[PDB]
Amino acid sequence: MTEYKLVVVGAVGVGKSALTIQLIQNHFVDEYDPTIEDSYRKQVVIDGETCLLDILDTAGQEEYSAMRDQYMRTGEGFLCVFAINNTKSFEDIHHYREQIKRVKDSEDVPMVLVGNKSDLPSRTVDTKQAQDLARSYGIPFIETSAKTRQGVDDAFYTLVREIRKHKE
Amino acid sequence: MYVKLISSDGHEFIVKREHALTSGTIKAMLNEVNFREIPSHVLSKVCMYFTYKVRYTNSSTEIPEFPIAPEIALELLMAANFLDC
Amino acid sequence: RPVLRSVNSREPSQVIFCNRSPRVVLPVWLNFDGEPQPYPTLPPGTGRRIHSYRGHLWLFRDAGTHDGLLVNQTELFVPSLNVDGQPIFANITLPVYTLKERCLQVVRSLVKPENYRRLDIVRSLYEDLEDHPNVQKDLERLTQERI
Amino acid sequence: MDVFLMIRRHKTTIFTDAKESSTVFELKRIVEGILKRPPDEQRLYKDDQLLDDGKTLGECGFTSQTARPQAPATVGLAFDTFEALCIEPFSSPPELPDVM
Numbered sequence: 008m009t010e011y012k013l014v015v016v017g018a019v020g021v022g023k024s025a026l027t028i029q030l031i032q033n034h035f036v037d038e039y040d041p042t043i044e045d046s047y048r049k050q051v052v053i054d055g056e057t058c059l060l061d062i063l064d065t066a067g068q069e070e071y072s073a074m075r076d077q078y079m080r081t082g083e084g085f086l087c088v089f090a091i092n093n094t095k096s097f098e099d100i101h102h103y104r105e106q107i108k109r110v111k112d113s114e115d116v117p118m119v120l121v122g123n124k125s126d127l128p129s130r131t132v133d134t135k136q137a138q139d140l141a142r143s144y145g146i147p148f149i150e151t152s153a154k155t156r157q158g159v160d161d162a163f164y165t166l167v168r169e170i171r172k173h174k175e
Numbered sequence: 176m177y178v179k180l181i182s183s184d185g186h187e188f189i190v191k192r193e194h195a196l197t198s199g200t201i202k203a204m205l206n207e208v209n210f211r212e213i214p215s216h217v218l219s220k221v222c223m224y225f226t227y228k229v230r231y232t233n234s235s236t237e238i239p240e241f242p243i244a245p246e247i248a249l250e251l252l253m254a255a256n257f258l259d260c
Numbered sequence: 261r262p263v264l265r266s267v268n269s270r271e272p273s274q275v276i277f278c279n280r281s282p283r284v285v286l287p288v289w290l291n292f293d294g295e296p297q298p299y300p301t302l303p304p305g306t307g308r309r310i311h312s313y314r315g316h317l318w319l320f321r322d323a324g325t326h327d328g329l330l331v332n333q334t335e336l337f338v339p340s341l342n343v344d345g346q347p348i349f350a351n352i353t354l355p356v357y358t359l360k361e362r363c364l365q366v367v368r369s370l371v372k373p374e375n376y377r378r379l380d381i382v383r384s385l386y387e388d389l390e391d392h393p394n395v396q397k398d399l400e401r402l403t404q405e406r407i
Numbered sequence: 408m409d410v411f412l413m414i415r416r417h418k419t420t421i422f423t424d425a426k427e428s429s430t431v432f433e434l435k436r437i438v439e440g441i442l443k444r445p446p447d448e449q450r451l452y453k454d455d456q457l458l459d460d461g462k463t464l465g466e467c468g469f470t471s472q473t474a475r476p477q478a479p480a481t482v483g484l485a486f487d488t489f490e491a492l493c494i495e496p497f498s499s500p501p502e503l504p505d506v507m
């Protein structure tokens with residue numbers, strides 16, 4: 008069975024952990040330890056194909072060492088995720104993207120932009136600019152929210168789709 | 176000012192002295208110098224390289240590649256090593 | 261400690277890597293300890309908008325052979341300060357190789373190392389054949405030339 | 408615009424440059440200074456074509472694209488009466504060795 012190794016990146020407090028758990032344990036987690044980084048495996052079906060997802064939920068302080076570089080280098084696809092309530096996350100998306108391109112040694116790395124917390128009424132960045140930036144990157148944008156869980160599976164499965172397109 | 180460069184097969188190549196001075200070994204041999212180990216098809220390439228070097232040294236824009244045919248590669252290499260250029 | 265190192269400036273600088281060479285260009289960034297770090301390659305004739313930081317040291321080589329290349333008619337490249345948000349341009353070009361080095365390049369592309377010494381040339385050229393371009397050796401040379 | 412040429416006669420080859428605007432007569436003067444023959448006793452050729460010492464080099468077909476330093480375009484030279492344009496050829500490289 009074909010495996011897909013997914014890596015979720017973003018600033019601390021964007022919702023990476025809660026979103027990741029929402030993909031697997033099917034429950035929104037209101038508060039998760041900011042320091043806990045772990046991987047999770049889940050057997051799923053995408054377009055009929057029985058895929059195995061391996062999701063690394065990144066967390067912790069910056070580490071631009073050889074070891075962290077190689078750890079992230081094993082990622083086949085990346086979820087650059089931001090929160091619509093935090094401007095800094097949408098600004099940081101670019102830095103995370105450049106780091107991915109460095110460790111993957113390519114300008115074309117499978118990834119999907121995510122606008123999380125689409126249940127919060129406050130909007131610092133609307134759904135419109137994110138699609139513009141993704142267009143500048145050449146990736147899809149999904150406005151999923153882990154709290155309401157709308158579009159989370161769409162995001163992960165779209166990353167698997169982008170990976171499949173890159174492998175073909 | 177010009178210098179004559181005679182090849183092993185008797186070909187006379189007249190180049191500007193400033194350009195032939197690119198070769199350290201030629202600059203050491205100093206207005207007519209004979210080479211008994213370098214054929215005409217090699218000395219012609221060496222002279223072309225002299226003009227190429229003088230034209231593009233300290234140029235501000237892009238530089239074209241110096242073309243070297245595989246069949247001449249070895250002989251040109253030996254000539255370059257001996258001429259110190 | 262090494263003289264040829266990048267500065268931990270943490271100030272963004274947008275740079276344009278322009279490959280105006282026939283070769284496949286490997287960008288090499290000198291980290292804060294001076295060690296060369298290869299970056300993604302540029303196909304010939306390609307321009308790419310990269311993001312670096314002020315005071316960072318860059319050099320450019322042939323991706324396949326590590327042959328030396330020039331950037332803005334010099335060996336090393338350091339981004340300046342971006343005036344009004346415009347990008348700095350890094351023009352990567354060929355240098356005027358010595359005829360000996362150019363011939364050594366082409367012979368290296370034809371013969372395999374296993375057969376290098378089976379060529380009817382002076383023995384002095386055999387070691388020169390196996391002495392492939394080295395980023396570290398050029399860094400040593402450049403450092404002493406600054407001194 | 409500079410054009411880089413090797414003007415040849417018999418076993419002699421003169422490497423020099425000129426302007427694309429430079430006329431055939433000025434090049435004949437250049438060869439007078441080197442081979443000691445005035446633009447009277449000499450006739451320049453592009454391929455088998457005789458060049459009229461009044462037209463510019465670029466007007467004869469000598470462009471920067473076709474007359475580079477690393478690949479100069481050839482201009483034949485012939486000297487009572489003139490001689491048949493004779494350019495003795497260069498040597499030939501050997502058969503390419505097995506290892507290449």
Ligand SMILES: Nc1nc2c(ncn2[C@@H]2O[C@H](COP(=O)(O)OP(=O)(O)O)[C@@H](O)[C@H]2O)c(=O)[nH]1
Pocket residue numbers: 017018019020021022023024025026036037038039040041065066123124125126127151152153154155
């Ligand atoms: N309203 C809302 N809150 C969210 C959403 N996703 C995450 N959060 C909250 O944001 C906080 C930080 O998210 P967290 O999972 O710890 O992200 P991480 O630490 O970067 O991996 C958590 O307490 C979540 O309750 C969402 O879609 N909507």
Ligand SMILES: [Mg+2]
Pocket residue numbers: 023024039040041042043044064065066
């Ligand atoms: Mg976390």
